Design a binder for this molecule. Structure first.
Ligand SMILES: [Hg+2]
Ligand SMILES: [Zn+2]
Length: 258
């Protein structure tokens, strides 16, 4: 009865083991674009990924994580709503069984086919584990995916998925450049929220880019061939691994653009 995304163990059940699921700053949320407010106080977003060192890709039973060396400032996020420097630790995606769903955040109730999360921790707390004990511990850059033309910079990810089909499998994944997953514009919305998987901790400054990236149908179809289950167990496709929008609870979403 471990948490997951099935009928028996999915988001509507998480509150039993993780009561913060009903907390005051849970994620994701619907971004109501007209009630967001442009904030001219928002310092410029600096995404500095030139020196990133990817290491490994892991099927963790709920998504796949591309992991980075976070022992030095090598891939960092600064500016915008953030104070100081946040280091990239991993990215992963959420996606649907169908192109019409899969994102966690929505925009005026519109669901995208998938959503990329680049997860960063605030260097003032020393490592990720200490950072998730803090209200300003994490910054997540969220990027929507729509189905259209292929994203060349995603193909190395797509191709390695065959080697991490099942829960617990990992593979070397060096020399991957996350700059190839960014849209042209860094216009964004920001609000305070939480992890979107258990333990659902309320540590996150969310930075959700307005411009989606386009990926091809063939690319997202490969995501949908992954398995939630381990090797040798009956196949349960890793699809619909998204938490739906949660109550905003009077939080204000800020826009970086007028
Ligand atoms: Hg998991
Ligand atoms: Zn995520």
């Amino acid at each position: 009865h471990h948490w997951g995304y099935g009928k028996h163990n999915g988001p509507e059940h998480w509150h039993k083991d993780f009561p913060i699921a009903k907390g005051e700053r849970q994620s994701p949320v619907d971004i109501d674009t007209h009630t967001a407010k442009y904030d001219p106080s928002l310092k410029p977003l600096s995404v500095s990924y030139d020196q990133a060192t990817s290491l490994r890709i892991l099927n963790n039973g709920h998504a796949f994580n591309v992991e980075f060396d976070d022992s030095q400032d090598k891939a960092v996020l600064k500016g915008g709503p953030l104070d100081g420097t946040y280091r990239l630790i991993q990215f992963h995606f959420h996606w649907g069984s169908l192109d019409g769903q899969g994102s966690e955040h929505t925009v005026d109730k519109k669901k995208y086919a998938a959503e990329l999360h680049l997860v960063h921790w605030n260097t003032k707390y020393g490592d990720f584990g200490k950072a998730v004990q803090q209200p300003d511990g994490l910054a997540v850059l969220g990027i929507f995916l729509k189905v259209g033309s292929a994203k060349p910079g995603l193909q190395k990810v797509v191709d390695v998925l065959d080697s991490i089909k099942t829960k617990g499998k990992s593979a070397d994944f060096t020399n991957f450049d996350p700059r190839g997953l960014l849209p042209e514009s860094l216009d964004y919305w920001t609000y305070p929220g939480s992890l979107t998987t258990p333990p659902l901790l309320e540590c996150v400054t969310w930075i959700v880019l307005k411009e989606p990236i386009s990926v091809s149908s063939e690319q997202v179809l490969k995501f949908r061939k992954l398995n939630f289950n381990g090797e040798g167990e009956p196949e349960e496709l890793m699809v619909d691994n998204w938490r739906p929008a949660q109550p905003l609870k009077n939080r204000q979403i800020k826009a970086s653009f007028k």
